[PDB]
């Protein structure tokens, strides 16, 4: 018996859901006064485990109506003869005991798309759902609610009109969203006053709502075992976070305080990727909005990817971590196609930073020669000349780029339609050497007698990654100073 106060984060979407499934059911005469019919189908999507099945049961028990349920991978695994009668029994029983809701989940297993890999059944069940849903609108108190994992694998005939027209995007919560579900899942565990809530929510930063019930039970089981309460940090080191090996990794929590110096890059990254994503009211009357492309070049170990995850956690957006040789090139045609779906994924989860490394190869793709590959590294730049400036005013994406060789820049990639804002990342000077190194030994319980001004005087042409070896060698011998302290 769940209610409205059991989940949060999507409260802006939970309010617009309550006017979609409760308002036509509790007040069906309001649509009679306006003339039009009430909507029938609203679907939800996102990552599975944000509470997609718990959301439908919460609004069902908070309304007192009938709750019909048809499972996705259960009724479609029959021999194509009982599925069309189960859907006929589903709409007939909901009409008998109106008001009623109909919740279905995993509709992608019922309704896939038509592709080149034909051979499945793919029919006789979704077409039964087409002829069942377009009727029944004779002011009947029935609604259908769909749920799926991938919102783009669904057949486009469902999301046309009158069958599934309204959509909601329940995704991962923010830092305050995981803070709300942490107070919900810890209402019965008798914790002490040593636990935190804001710091425990901020140290997660990528945790789906299903993990909060598992991370609470793992820390509670550890407290039981010590009988024959800061065990939450033990649970993060043992349990693996959900969305394990996807492109949504967040395990490094370096903010803008932990990275020092380079003030000609911090304010010059605030000008391009935080201004249209926060204040777009001035960008619609001062030309085109987005400043997507930005280039970073310089010496090796100058701090290129140190600021990659730092800007990705400031606005708490997604971070597409695509490596350099990610064009896998198993054949001849898929090498230009595997770069396009990750751009469409950036448009779905917009705004989202995308990272690349040294993919400029049209200067070596000269015309009419003999030494060339079989279709890669000469025609994938022709896809790069048409998929980078595929912009939209409702997405305002931005793409960063870090390289170490500014001499091989293509003459067509240094263009305002491509990555144009090139910024040299220089060496850290004597003032930036203190701002980088002091933020890295903040976790070290060091003595304040040793000042790093002598390190900056002993390092004149050293890079910041070479300075990171100095604090690593100082910490590795402080470990040896701690090893020869407990044995005697």
């Amino acid at each position: 018996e769940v209610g409205y106060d059991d989940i949060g984060g999507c409260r802006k979407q939970m309010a617009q859901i309550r006017e979609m499934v409760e308002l036509p059911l509790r007040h069906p005469q309001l649509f009679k006064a306006i003339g039009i019919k009430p909507p029938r189908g609203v679907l939800m999507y996102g990552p599975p485990g944000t509470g997609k099945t718990l959301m439908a049961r919460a609004v069902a028990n908070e309304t007192g109506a009938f709750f019909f349920l048809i499972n996705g991978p259960e009724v479609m695994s029959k021999m194509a003869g009982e599925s069309e009668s189960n859907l006929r029994k589903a709409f007939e029983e909901a009409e008998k005991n109106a008001p009623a809701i109909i919740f279905i989940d995993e509709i992608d297993s019922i309704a896939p798309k038509r592709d080149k890999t034909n051979g499945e059944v793919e029919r006789r069940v979704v077409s039964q759902l087409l002829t069942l849903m377009d009727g029944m609108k004779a002011r009947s108190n029935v609604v259908v609610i769909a749920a799926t994992n991938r919102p783009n694998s669904i057949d486009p005939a469902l999301r046309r009109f009158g069958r599934f027209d309204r959509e909601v995007d329940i995704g991962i919560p923010d830092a305050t969203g995981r803070l709300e579900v942490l107070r919900i899942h810890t209402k019965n565990m008798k914790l002490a006053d040593d636990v935190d809530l804001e710091a425990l929510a901020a140290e997660t930063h990528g945790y789906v709502g299903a993990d909060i019930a598992s991370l609470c039970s793992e820390a509670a089981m550890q407290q039981i075992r010590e009988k024959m309460m800061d065990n939450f940090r033990f649970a993060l080191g043992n349990s693996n976070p959900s969305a394990l090996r996807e492109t949504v990794v967040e395990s490094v929590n370096v903010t803008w305080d932990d990275v020092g110096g380079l003030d000609e890059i911090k304010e010059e990254l605030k000008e391009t990727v935080e201004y249209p994503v926060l204040h777009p009211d001035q960008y619609t009357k001062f030309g085109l909005s987005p400043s997507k492309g930005v280039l970073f070049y310089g010496p090796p170990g100058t701090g290129k990817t140190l600021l990659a995850k730092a800007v990705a956690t400031e606005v708490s957006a997604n971070f597409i971590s695509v490596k350099g040789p990610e064009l896998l090139s198993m054949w001849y045609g898929e090498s230009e196609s595997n770069i396009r779906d990750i751009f469409d994924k950036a448009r779905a989860a917009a705004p989202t930073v995308v990272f690349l490394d040294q993919l400029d190869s049209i200067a070596k793709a000269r015309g009419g020669s003999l030494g060339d590959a079989g279709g890669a590294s000469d025609r994938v730049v022709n896809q790069l000349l048409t998929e980078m400036d595929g912009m939209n005013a409702k997405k305002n994406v931005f793409v960063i780029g870090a390289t170490n060789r500014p001499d091989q820049i293509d003459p067509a990639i240094l263009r305002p339609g491509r990555l144009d804002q090139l910024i040299y990342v220089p060496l850290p000077d004597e003032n930036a050497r203190l701002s980088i190194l002091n933020a890295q030994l903040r976790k070290t319980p060091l003595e304040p007698g040793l000042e790093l001004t002598a390190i900056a005087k002993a390092t004149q042409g050293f890079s910041g990654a070479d300075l990171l070896y100095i604090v690593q060698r100082a910490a590795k011998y402080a470990i040896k100073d701690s090893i020869e302290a407990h044995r005697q």
Binding site: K116, G119, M330, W331, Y332, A373, G374, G375, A376
Partner: protein
């Protein structure tokens, strides 16, 4: 620096739906099906 691409093809099924051997139906007739509550079925005697 080259590729190998090949597709596939399938055939789904055919069926006949043949069943009901005659020896199962002859055993299917000679049985009982149950009688409500008080629907006795009787005996009878005669021809001394």
């Amino acid at each position: 620096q080259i590729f190998v691409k090949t597709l596939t093809g399938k055939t789904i099924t055919l069926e006949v739906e043949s069943s009901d051997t005659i020896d199962n139906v002859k055993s299917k007739i000679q049985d009982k099906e149950g009688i409500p509550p008080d629907q006795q079925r009787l005996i009878f005697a005669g021809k001394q």
